[PDB]
Every structure is written in C-alpha cells, then in structure tokens.
Enzyme design. Structure first.
Site, PDB file in Angstrom:
ATOM      1  N   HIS A  46      -1.112   8.819  -4.783  1.00 48.22           N
ATOM      2  CA  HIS A  46      -0.693   7.990  -5.904  1.00 48.22           C
ATOM      3  C   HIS A  46      -1.077   6.519  -5.686  1.00 48.22           C
ATOM      4  CE1 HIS A  46       2.683  10.423  -3.900  1.00 48.22           C
ATOM      5  NE2 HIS A  46       2.498  11.153  -4.997  1.00 48.22           N
ATOM      6  N   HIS A  48       0.284   2.612  -5.536  1.00 47.55           N
ATOM      7  CA  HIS A  48       1.438   1.788  -5.185  1.00 47.55           C
ATOM      8  C   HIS A  48       1.136   0.329  -5.523  1.00 47.55           C
ATOM      9  CE1 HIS A  48       3.351   4.902  -2.337  1.00 47.55           C
ATOM     10  NE2 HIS A  48       2.209   5.428  -2.825  1.00 47.55           N
ATOM     11  N   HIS A  63       5.837   3.328  -6.168  1.00 48.59           N
ATOM     12  CA  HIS A  63       4.745   3.588  -7.084  1.00 48.59           C
ATOM     13  C   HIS A  63       4.768   2.517  -8.162  1.00 48.59           C
ATOM     14  CE1 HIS A  63       4.918   8.039  -5.617  1.00 48.59           C
ATOM     15  NE2 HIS A  63       4.886   7.095  -4.680  1.00 48.59           N
ATOM     16  N   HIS A  71       9.645   9.479 -10.907  1.00 51.06           N
ATOM     17  CA  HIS A  71       8.484  10.049 -10.261  1.00 51.06           C
ATOM     18  C   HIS A  71       8.188  11.428 -10.837  1.00 51.06           C
ATOM     19  CE1 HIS A  71       5.565  11.016  -7.231  1.00 51.06           C
ATOM     20  NE2 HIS A  71       6.315  12.081  -6.927  1.00 51.06           N
ATOM     21  N   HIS A  80       5.520   7.827 -12.870  1.00 47.74           N
ATOM     22  CA  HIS A  80       5.546   6.369 -12.902  1.00 47.74           C
ATOM     23  C   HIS A  80       4.396   5.800 -13.734  1.00 47.74           C
ATOM     24  CE1 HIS A  80       8.211   6.852  -9.186  1.00 47.74           C
ATOM     25  NE2 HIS A  80       8.921   6.265 -10.150  1.00 47.74           N
ATOM     26  N   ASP A  83       1.036   8.267 -10.415  1.00 49.34           N
ATOM     27  CA  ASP A  83       1.376   9.561  -9.831  1.00 49.34           C
ATOM     28  C   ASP A  83       0.286  10.595 -10.131  1.00 49.34           C
ATOM     29  OD1 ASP A  83       3.596   8.103  -9.123  1.00 49.34           O
ATOM     30  OD2 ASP A  83       5.025   9.186 -10.375  1.00 49.34           O
ATOM     31  N   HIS A 120      -0.158  10.173   1.425  1.00 49.00           N
ATOM     32  CA  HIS A 120       1.041  10.705   2.048  1.00 49.00           C
ATOM     33  C   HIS A 120       0.727  11.912   2.938  1.00 49.00           C
ATOM     34  CE1 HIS A 120       3.858   8.339  -0.559  1.00 49.00           C
ATOM     35  NE2 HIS A 120       2.904   8.528  -1.494  1.00 49.00           N
ATOM     36  N   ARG A 143       3.858   7.057   4.194  1.00 49.92           N
ATOM     37  CA  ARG A 143       2.718   6.176   3.966  1.00 49.92           C
ATOM     38  C   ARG A 143       1.672   6.230   5.093  1.00 49.92           C
ATOM     39  NH1 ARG A 143       7.138   1.301   3.119  1.00 49.92           N
ATOM     40  NH2 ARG A 143       8.331   2.374   1.446  1.00 49.92           N
TER      41      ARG A 143
HETATM   42 CU    CU Z   1       1.845   7.398  -3.028  1.00 49.80          CU
HETATM   43 ZN    ZN Z   2       5.559   8.324  -8.662  1.00 47.32          ZN
END
Ligand code: CU
Ligand code: ZN
Length: 153
Positions: A46, A48, A63, A71, A80, A83, A120, A143
């Site tokens: 995703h 950020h 996000h 989410h 978001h 995503d 992730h 992360r």
């Molecule tokens: Cu992410």
């Molecule tokens: Zn999200």
C-alpha cells in the site's frame, strides 16, 4: 511526466524497485516492480504518508487518507485510497508486481510524487481482524522496506 520510480529499502535485505508509467493524464497508472529479499507468499502492499525521508523510513505513517475511510483492499470500498491489498513472492523472496490502478495519478492535477510505499511482511488482512492495526493497516506487518516516489520523467 508519465514516469516515476520508488526505491523500496529498509534495514532488512528486502529492497525493491517500483516503476510507475501513466500513459495519459487521467489514464490509469501502470505500476510494475520487483521486491527482493522478503519471505514468500502474500505481502501487504500500500501507499503511506511520510515524504520527510530525511534519514530513513523510521516513522512511516498510516495509509494515506483523503477524508475518512477504514482499511480494506480489493474486496471492500472502505479502503483508505492507497490500499492495493497484497502481492505474491516466490520462494527466493522475489515479489513481482505488474498492474494498472485508477485511484492515483503522477501526471495531471494531483501529481502524486513524494509518496512513500511500504512493503509489509504478512498478507494484508483486508482489515477484518477487528482491531486497530487491522482497520489501520490490515495487520500486515511492521513496515519491512519502504522509500519515496521519485520523478523519473
Ligand atoms: Cu502499507
Ligand atoms: Zn489501508
């Protein structure tokens, strides 16, 4: 213009080169890339909020969020914005990406340069876990690697 790149990296050996091509102004953004050095299987993936990548991806935010949405990913609409859901990695720890999204634009009005993707560890849960980190990140993992979208041209 059409092109930007993001050099995903962290402390871990996980590093990746994402590439963006918008073949128009309002057309979809073709994202393709390779991440190298994670475990296999599904990896939450995703956009950020961060941008101030002064030293490194320390405090990469939640996000990016336009107003308020929970989410999600490619199941719900209460996602978001950034995503994408999750991507598959082979046994060597190589995740390939090659798709085209309609939710962002690096050319035209909003010109979404700067933005910080994070890759992730585990699969994005689609925020079904039913706790903060499900509704914030889809409990996807702490992360692993991340960077910033740099204009390529
Ligand atoms: Cu992410
Ligand atoms: Zn999200």
């Amino acid at each position: 213009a059409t092109k930007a790149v993001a050099v995903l990296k962290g402390d871990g050996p996980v590093q990746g080169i994402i590439n963006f091509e918008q073949k128009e102004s309002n057309g979809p953004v073709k994202v393709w890339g390779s991440i190298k050095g994670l475990t296999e299987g599904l990896h939450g993936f995703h956009v950020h909020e961060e941008e101030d990548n002064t030293a490194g991806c320390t405090s990469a935010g939640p996000h990016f969020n336009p107003l308020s949405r929970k989410h999600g990913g490619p199941k719900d609409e209460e996602r978001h914005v950034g995503d994408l859901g999750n991507v598959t990695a082979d046994k060597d720890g190589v995740a390939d990406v090659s798709i085209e999204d309609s939710v962002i634009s690096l050319s035209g009005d909003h010109s979404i340069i700067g933005r910080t993707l994070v890759v992730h560890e585990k699969a994005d849960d689609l925020g079904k876990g039913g706790n903060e980190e499900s509704t914030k990140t889809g409990n996807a993992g702490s992360r692993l690697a991340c960077g910033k979208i740099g204009k390529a041209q």
